[PDB]
Symmetry: C2
Subunit: 507 residues, 2 copies
């Protein structure tokens, strides 16, 4: 175990490792041990640590890290690891490691991702994915003046896991439903995973072809316990398995008219390293998680959530579904900022109000502020995902508020699209921490405001009430109202429910 105690420099704080831990970033002085080989925490992983003092670590292989007594300690069995002086800022260190170790492809996903909101049927239809309600939802989007965008039909549309046809008892005419949504100006995407019903026609076919993931000491297909139950699994190291699976999906796209797929669930968190006979003998569970994600390169409409490396790449990267609570709402920015720093620039900031359906089931009188404040966050991010039906849970007033912010995102999208090409080519995030853009200027822990590009500072409401701190750095700052300021100084502002604070830099 090639240990490397990294004592910090002056003021030096550390980011990196698990994208789910963006909210706990930069790291405090005591941090529990993190094993990249075992837990992705229902999110993304990269073997990268970056500091505000212009240093970084990169590993070819997963490792363990922790903070003890201010020190960053790092344990790898495969290699002994050293930091790198690349400048003197967080920004400088991020661009060195990126350009060197996860250079951007020079390409992006579809531009519709950034322009349009995403509407996930998870919170509303849950498992009862059926044509009827999909069209009810799709119309109510329009009727309530929300923009059309990517309609992401979630789990339980397919007959069973491994099958890529619709349940016909739920979809009397899915080809026509797709046309209908296309005429209404939407895009459509389907939820998929490497899991396969273990007793299915498809299972045996794949098992014959050795396309399933195989258990070591048994040569048998590996049966994975995951959030839905136990399934056989596609070996994502097997290229012919992925070749076949690719054509599986294309056939769906012709047959039904689907634009792309949501790739969810290559969690290494379910896998136990070493137990598997991967097709690739130099492959880890991490490799497999990377290979499920790589599959999305072959589809310009794609979104995923589990990933290892694949920094700089044209991959929509969703933040893991979280909870209907303020604490969780506050984690959107910090978690998202990290995603960018660690390669995954194009980022959907999770679902609106919570990606957990059970919170919205059995509900009568909601906390309507949280929904709206949560909306505001998304407005000035690369993408914006809803799931719950504002029109159903909110007041008509509050719905329209959200519908403003959807149109405000859509207004902003020209600039977001611009930034994404700068991300894909330079390797600058779209959404940047304050310490990123303004290093050593006391914005190191600043976890409740961020830069959209290097132009707009955004300090949305992340708590109940109608007041807010804002640290402005040096420069001339015009809020959305139009009122000019200049920093460095720390203003208080009046934030009504239908106010998102953001400040254009005007020289």
């Amino acid at each position: 175990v090639f240990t490397t105690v990294v004592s910090p420099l002056k003021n030096e704080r550390w980011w990196g490792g698990v994208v789910a831990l963006g909210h706990q970033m930069p790291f405090g002085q005591q941090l529990a041990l993190q094993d990249l080989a075992r837990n992705n925490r229902n999110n993304q992983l990269v073997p990268c640590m970056i500091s505000s003092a212009g240093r970084y670590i990169w590993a070819e292989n997963p490792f363990r890290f922790e903070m003890k007594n201010g020190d960053l300690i790092v344990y790898s069995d495969s290699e002994k690891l050293e930091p790198v002086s690349a400048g003197t800022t967080l920004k400088e260190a991020q661009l060195a490691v990126a350009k060197k170790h996860f250079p951007s492809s020079g390409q992006i996903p579809k531009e519709e991702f950034f322009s349009l909101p995403q509407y996930n049927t998870w919170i509303e239809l849950m498992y009862d994915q059926n044509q009827r309600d999909i069209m009810q939802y799709a119309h109510k989007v329009v009727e309530n003046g929300f923009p059309q965008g990517v309609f992401m039909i979630d789990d339980n549309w397919q007959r069973y896991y491994g099958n890529f046809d619709f349940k016909p008892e739920k979809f009397p005419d899915p080809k026509g439903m797709t046309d209908e949504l296309h005429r209404m100006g939407f895009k459509v995407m389907l939820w998929i995973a490497p899991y396969v019903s273990a007793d299915s026609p498809e299972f045996r076919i794949l098992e014959k072809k050795g396309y399933l993931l195989k258990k070591k000491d048994t040569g048998q297909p590996a049966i994975i316990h995951w959030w839905n139950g136990f399934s056989a699994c596609y070996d994502t190291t097997n290229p012919e398995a992925m070749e076949y699976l690719k054509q599986q999906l294309r056939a769906n796209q012709e047959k039904y008219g689907i634009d792309g797929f949501k790739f969810d669930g290559a969690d290494i968190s379910y896998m136990t390293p070493g137990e598997y006979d991967f097709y690739d003998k130099d492959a880890t569970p991490n490799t497999f998680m990377e290979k499920w994600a790589a599959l999305g390169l072959s589809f310009p409409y794609n979104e995923l959530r589990a990933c290892w490396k694949l920094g700089g790449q044209a991959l929509v990267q969703r933040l893991g579904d979280k909870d209907y609570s303020w604490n969780a709402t506050r984690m959107l920015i910090p978690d998202m900022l990290a995603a960018g720093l660690l390669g995954y620039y194009y980022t959907c900031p999770d679902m609106i109000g919570g990606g957990q359906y059970s919170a919205f089931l059995n509900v009568k009188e909601f906390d309507e502020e949280l929904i709206v404040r949560s909306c505001q966050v998304h407005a000035l991010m690369p993408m914006m995902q809803f799931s719950v039906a504002p029109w159903r849970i909110l007041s008509k007033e509050n719905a329209d508020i959200c519908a403003h912010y959807a149109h405000l995102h859509q207004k902003m999208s020209g600039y977001i699209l611009e930034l994404a090409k700068r991300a894909a080519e330079t390797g600058e995030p779209i959404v940047r921490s304050m310490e990123y853009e303004y290093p050593h200027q006391g914005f190191t822990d600043c976890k409740d405001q961020y830069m959209l590009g290097d132009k707009y500072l955004v300090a949305p409401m992340v708590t109940p009430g109608v007041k807010r701190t804002v640290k402005l750095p040096k420069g001339k700052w015009k809020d959305e109202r139009g009122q000019i300021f200049k920093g460095p100084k720390v203003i208080d502002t009046d934030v009504p429910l239908n106010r998102l604070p953001y400040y254009e830099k005007i020289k």
Copy 2:
């Protein structure tokens, strides 16, 4: 302890019992490899019962191991020390003692249409692709080609997936109407089911919540069984509420779709590893589980099963494992069918015709001779389509024999009530009806009741040995004989040899 019991044979004494799949290797030679009732059912039924031709028997409440070494029957039980019992001096006498004592008959039977009618299984024809269209094509071709109507047993893959008991609607546009249609044509319909549940299915989660799945011990988590179709979670059959629920699962199917009963297939203890599981019943073994999947059939008068432990005397249709397409396998039907009888599974379906393994599908004689065997058994199952694989001539031959079974059914129905009340098999070994008279390994002829001796063709050609015992014997042609003597006969393809006892 391993409570071992070396059981020396008496004079000339031969032994039956244990595994119904081993009926063909019965009675047992001097060397039989070790047989563990706790582990392998051999794709068929199991009973803790051994019977001898010298009027002796063994019974165990629990599984055991047995084997033949050097003439001796050796017996290994962890739970109990085991000993034989003098019940008369014949095989017949010993069978009726153990039956009346340890698996007495219920006094009831399954539906009478089982015995009257042939069964038509769609596995060989449709296989995995079970669909309304081809079911109706097959059903008509039965009729068109002059074969009789009977129980239409739609086999695996009609259901949306494992655990679900609705049809695939992409295959069944109107399954309720298809049921009526088949009822109007004078058929009955039965559906294939198993305790296996897709491990990732809605139903899996529902059951998982209710603790209705079979639970692994060390994890209290669903037990995931690797079986012939793949890996599935499983219904805990020892959980009575689970089975309560499952019963209503099926009844709902019967109203909704119009189904008369179900084929219960796959409680194999062969898949389970004893001890690893938290059964609901804490006293339960894998064997218990296997018994409880089968007990489920009591609740539906249209039922057929294949995996089972105990449940002797009971109104349960019992099938033989899906055999091979060869003569080798054809020869085992009779002695396997006889072994069912002895062991309490009186009402018995004889495997499939031609082979219950679809991959094999012509040698048209084998099919027709295989048909002839079934003709004079309690039931008769086809699967492969004679009209497709045979000459029209040979099809008609089979169609006669189906009509001959149907003719004979009055007597078979009579015998089933004698079985359900006395505990005498419908189909009886020669040694059963005529003990000590050198019919001990008679494996190519049997008694239908105590009336008709049946010596069907068991090999290619057109000649056949027949041991007649004492008594007056009229063949089907009408020509009278008397034994004990050993006749030859001319058996053309369209001849089933059988001899009525006329005094």
